[PDB]
Amino acid sequence: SEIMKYVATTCPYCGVGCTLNLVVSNGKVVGVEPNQRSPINEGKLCPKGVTCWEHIHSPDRLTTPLIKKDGKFIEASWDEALDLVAKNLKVIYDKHGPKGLGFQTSCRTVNEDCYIFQKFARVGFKTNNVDNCARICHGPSVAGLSLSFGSGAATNGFEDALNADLILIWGSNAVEAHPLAGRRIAQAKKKGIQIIAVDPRYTMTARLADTYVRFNPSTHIALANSMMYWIIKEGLEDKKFIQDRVNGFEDLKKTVENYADAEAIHGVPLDVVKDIAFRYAKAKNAVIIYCTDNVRSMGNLALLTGNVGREGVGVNPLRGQNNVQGACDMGAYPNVYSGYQKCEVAENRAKMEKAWSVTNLPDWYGATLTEQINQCGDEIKGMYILGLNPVVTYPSSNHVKAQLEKLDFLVVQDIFFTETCQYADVILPGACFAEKDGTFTSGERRINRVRKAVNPPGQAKEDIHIISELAAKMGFKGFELPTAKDVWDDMRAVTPSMFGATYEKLERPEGICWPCPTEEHPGTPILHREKFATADGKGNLFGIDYRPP
């Protein structure tokens, strides 16, 4: 057939979204090659990207559906397994309404599968009990940055920090995780850019920094409060910015004026505090790289120094999962439909109803991952898990196992036989990133294409196909979407932003950044261009008091 064919794809291992070539010989992925054309990484990959191809053709991959029949799983046909799932979901619905079910997907999955998953969870039985890894993962920082600015995403890109004078890494292992985001720090120091690292431990990304600052762990609020106190005290705040685009300054004033001497809390001497504070406030264009109160303090700093809406500046919280941003965008949260359209507002609730040809959408705040797992027997019973391994990921794994065994009809879709699989009643095999054909979304809001290299191992299918077949079994209208392009077009019709991100535009190696409202718009690589995304269009900066644990 084919000998050494190159297929361009996105790396599935973190939020940088590096591009790579998979080498496919006789329908087998046999290696990973650089793609020098990519703007994100210029053909450069970390160890994970270099060896992403190893797990694709493992013998352990699930090949056919499995059904727990009075013990060890026996081999089932697709029709059999799907009819079983449809029957059990139907009965649990008809007995316990929409509260009885529970959905959660992984951030490993492509945008089209996250969107169709949340569409399945809402168009059919109307439940907002949909969620994903981002809860239990490191950062609920999206909510905090949303409160500060309006969009919880990173304000600027990665190439953007090359334009600053004062990259300020803060508590980030940006070279251990996101190494090709830390490549920007390496390039910047080669260009001679002031770099200040502030992690509690001397990490390999703190080696690159001109100044390194220890502080006692769990004291970010105290340290940032001190820095803002000195900025206010010597008046290096940005008056036009604060008076024009920011609100809450008096509250910040009261809250911070109690942090003149905080050496007791954080270990940093007042001399070093003044040094970093004045370097940051004096830098004309300074970018913060972060990795709830902790992220709102960063928003406080950026708003206080007027470092937001411009090239070479901003706040860039690093995500960590390959498609966590994409899942949140597609609307795999309890409270947002898609593109962060809140379900609390009847306006877009009715817009969803009209677009999806369904009625009486829930509008109540769903149950997050831990909410579901804790109430996994009390009112929730019946659970579809799209790619999670909760027994290995959640803390108190034994409690997780107890709750899952308290559960009626778990369904698990995975590419491998995990530990959570033993507790499933049905196991639907899935496809990995080399067999899907969707899109990922980087941490810098960039939509990248994933391309099909090989076929799923045996009888395994990809998630859009599985969910469409299940919805056709259960009699649900609106899941007639045979391709990732059709799923994407349905999503685009639904969402106001991302309406310009057609696949003919995503076939560009550059990709598209998420606020792309029209088809001629080139994208929005820098957010909050001259107005924010809150009610008055003005960022709010809050006063946080440090709580000792």
Binding site: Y6, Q36, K44, P47, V50, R183, Q187, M204
Partner: protein, 411 residues
């Protein structure tokens, strides 16, 4: 026609001759070899996307080489290591491969180390005056040329300037001016001196073609009997036209080659003294190499690194988990590669941490060369440590005029 002839060559097929960068002779020769069954496949470069994307391609259908026609100056890749990894080193199948000077040198390095079969491989070599990274070319065009890069149709380095053809007209800027401003050819391409691959089987270029054929003929130099046979077969079956080259063309070809040698020497100088001398060079090297995150891209991309397991992976040399890795990591590559480095730049350009691997390695290589007199990538000469000789060892000890190896070795 016989191993040393210098010819003008263009394709009989008008479409092949249009799509060739010059006369289409590389694409006519490759097509002929494929369809007359000298070779079982053809490894060439095609555009996968915009002309800034160069994708290697194994082609077995003779109908697909018209897609390979044209030269991509943003193709900074290296072919021979892909043939060893995913084509079993050409141990069972004949191939015909289009290659630049660095790609010919890499072929010879891997054949020295027994990793490919040059009896099976046919190397059609192209002249190379330099390659540009695709993304750097984009930034060049956006900033210095003041053009939207997606507008460009074709783009080439001709007469030492960067001609781009966009909608509206064409432009040109001296590559030396660009290279001073911080753009241009890759660093190793600036230092390169393998301009006409005379170690390949055929050397094709646009240098020395003068007069009525200045854009519709390829200057061919027949560098081996295998290439002579390929050319004679193509000319007889009528896929290729041959006229003897013009002596004035040969002369100015020699002059341009010599000038490119001098420019390469100048860049070698300014770069190697830019690295420093004494303990300053050790702080440059050590502080740069402290960035390495052990992605091993430099090892996997180097043509000379053919080892099943690198010694950089052995726990008695490098501690497995310590990430701010030792200088031993790069000392083990200086020791193993620097004697034969072909200055391909792959190690430098695939490094996520932007470490000047190629600059360090070539700075060591140039004077290992002027010490032992071994030029990498030219022929089947074994590596310096794979062939030690009694008389030569006596000679270097006597030349030091000393009873040991301590001093009077360098000037």
């Amino acid at each position: 026609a016989a191993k040393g002839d210098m010819l003008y060559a263009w394709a009989k097929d008008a479409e092949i001759q249009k799509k060739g960068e010059c006369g289409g002779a590389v694409t006519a020769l490759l097509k002929h070899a494929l369809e007359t069954k000298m070779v079982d496949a053809v490894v060439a470069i095609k555009k996968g996307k915009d002309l800034y994307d160069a994708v290697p391609t194994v082609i077995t259908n003779p109908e697909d080489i018209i897609q390979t026609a044209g030269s991509l100056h943003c193709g900074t890749l290296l072919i021979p290591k892909l043939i060893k990894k995913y084509l079993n080193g050409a141990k069972d199948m004949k191939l015909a491969v289009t290659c630049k000077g660095c790609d010919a040198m890499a072929f010879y390095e891997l054949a020295k180390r027994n990793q490919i079969n040059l009896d099976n491989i046919i190397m059609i070599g192209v002249n190379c005056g330099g390659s540009v990274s695709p993304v750097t070319a984009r930034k060049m065009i956006s900033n210095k040329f003041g053009v939207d890069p997606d507008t460009v149709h074709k783009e080439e380095i001709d007469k030492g300037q960067f001609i781009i053809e966009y909608e509206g007209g064409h432009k040109g800027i001296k590559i030396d001016e660009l290279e001073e401003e911080g753009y241009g050819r890759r660093s190793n391409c600036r230092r390169c001196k393998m301009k006409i691959p005379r170690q390949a089987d055929i050397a094709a270029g646009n240098w020395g073609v003068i007069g009525d054929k200045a854009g519709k003929a390829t200057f061919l130099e027949i560098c081996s009997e295998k290439g002579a046979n390929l050319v004679n077969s193509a000319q007889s079956k009528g896929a290729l036209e041959i006229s003897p080259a013009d002596p004035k063309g040969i002369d100015i070809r020699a002059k341009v080659e010599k000038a490119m040698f001098n420019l390469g020497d100048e860049w070698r100088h300014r770069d190697f003294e830019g690295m420093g001398k004494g303990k300053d060079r050790l702080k440059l090297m050590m502080s740069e190499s402290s960035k390495c995150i052990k992605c091993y891209a430099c090892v996997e991309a180097c043509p000379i690194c053919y080892c099943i397991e690198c010694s950089t992976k052995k726990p008695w040399y490098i501690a497995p988990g310590v990430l701010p890795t030792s200088f031993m990591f790069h000392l083990i590559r200086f020791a193993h590669v620097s004697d034969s480095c072909i200055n391909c730049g792959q190690c430098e350009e695939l490094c996520p941490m932007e470490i000047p691997n190629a600059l360090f390695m070539h700075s060591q290589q140039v004077e290992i060369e002027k010490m032992f007199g071994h030029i990498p990538g030219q022929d089947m000469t074994p590596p310096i440590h794979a062939f030690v000789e009694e008389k030569a060892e006596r000679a270097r000890l006597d030349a030091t005029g000393t009873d040991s190896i301590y001093t009077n070795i360098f000037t």
